[PDB]
Symmetry: D2
Subunit: 100 residues, 4 copies
């Protein structure tokens, strides 16, 4: 499929990792995710799709381990984000402004 | 279930008007904040991490399906050892 | 001059009244936020300060003698062999 | 207890022969690896040591006087007001600087 559904990508990731690390857990997955984000930061390569892939392989598989429906969770939080008020943070991302 | 590209389009359509000069560096900064929240904590928190990780791919122009499949093909040909943190490291 | 233990004491004296039940998990979470800010910065001693304030306080919360722990791990590191990793740091050879 | 500058000097004297052209980017990358190890630990001082070795060497590479920088930021933090965040740490209240 092209583009694949996020669940199909999770399944392809899991088909690779499950024979090798069937009882992997969220904590070790987050630890590896931080390693791979580090590699992306340090990457001198103007384009590094394989380092982005490492980050996404772990983030999508984290969702699998936590039983999270990626489509439902992302759309539910985007709906929350649309209803929120926002201000820019110094790092260039945003932070929401509390209502009640 | 949505395609990864459709979720990228929905994320970008929300953040782009609010943050028109968003960059990979600030996206990575925020991603690290949200991973911290997950450590300290949960589907909506996982959502925060994925919203930022997928938008980083958008900003870097990475075809997610193609890149993940390419790296999984590399990972299949590698041999692996279990790391102390419970994840793996490939054997050089 | 002030030692790492004295900086830990100064940090603890500031944060403890504000966050009397602070714990390693939230401190690691805040440390990740501040490393992110350092990454995104376009400059930055005060962002480095934010990282070190949290990392030194993490050692305090975990009961770690910073001088002795650093010197003990450096001694382990001297006994290892090292390869250059793609990110520009090193990884020891098993 | 050693001064932070002395610990930085010992760290630098160890790593510089092995990695003389090391940079902040790779040091941050490794720092994140070692923080991850602390998160996943089912235990420890040597893991805390890995984090601090890299965070202090980062300060060296960026030319930061650690004692001066930490004291300057603590002074700023004392003048701020603070709210507790959901992760258990604090975030300063915007606009609350005591003048
Ligand atoms: N892609 C993208 N998402 C962003 C950016 N700034 C904030 N966000 C989103 C990511 C998360 O879904 C959400 C986090 O909101 P925030 O105020 O920390 O609140 P919280 O939801 O973590 O409690 O905001 C940004 O610059 N880019
Ligand atoms: N989902 C998942 N992926 C894992 C785990 N351990 C390793 N991986 C994958 C994520 C990346 O695609 C890859 C990283 O390999 P590694 O030996 O650091 O090498 P590198 O490819 O970063 O150079 O391995 C793990 O425990 N879970
Ligand atoms: N300052 C500095 N320290 C470095 C660098 N590359 C590796 N190190 C040190 C930091 C830690 O004390 C140690 C981490 O070793 P590693 O092979 O991951 O093994 P481990 O000790 O985490 O099991 O190596 C580097 O580039 N700079
Ligand atoms: N040790 C410790 N320090 C904390 C905690 N919560 C916040 N801080 C400190 C660390 C940094 O010096 C500072 C971060 O402040 P913040 O409101 O993100 O603002 P900023 O200084 O990053 O702009 O606050 C906390 O729970 N523990
Ligand atoms: Mn990688
Ligand atoms: Mn790696
Ligand atoms: Mn790499
Ligand atoms: Mn969040
Ligand atoms: Mn947040
Ligand atoms: Mn949260
Ligand atoms: Mn901050
Ligand atoms: Mn900042
Ligand atoms: Mn800061
Ligand atoms: Mn370590
Ligand atoms: Mn390590
Ligand atoms: Mn370890």
């Amino acid at each position: 499929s092209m583009p694949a559904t996020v669940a199909e990508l999770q399944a392809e990731i899991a088909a690779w990792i499950h024979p090798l690390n069937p009882d992997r857990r969220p904590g070790g997955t987050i630890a590896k995710l931080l390693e791979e984000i580090g590699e992306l930061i340090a990457s001198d390569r103007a384009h590094d799709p394989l380092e982005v892939a490492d980050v996404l392989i772990l983030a999508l598989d984290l969702a699998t381990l936590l039983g999270v429906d990626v489509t439902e969770a992302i759309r539910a939080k985007l709906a929350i984000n649309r209803a929120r008020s926002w201000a820019r943070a110094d790092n260039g991302a945003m932070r929401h402004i509390p209502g009640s």
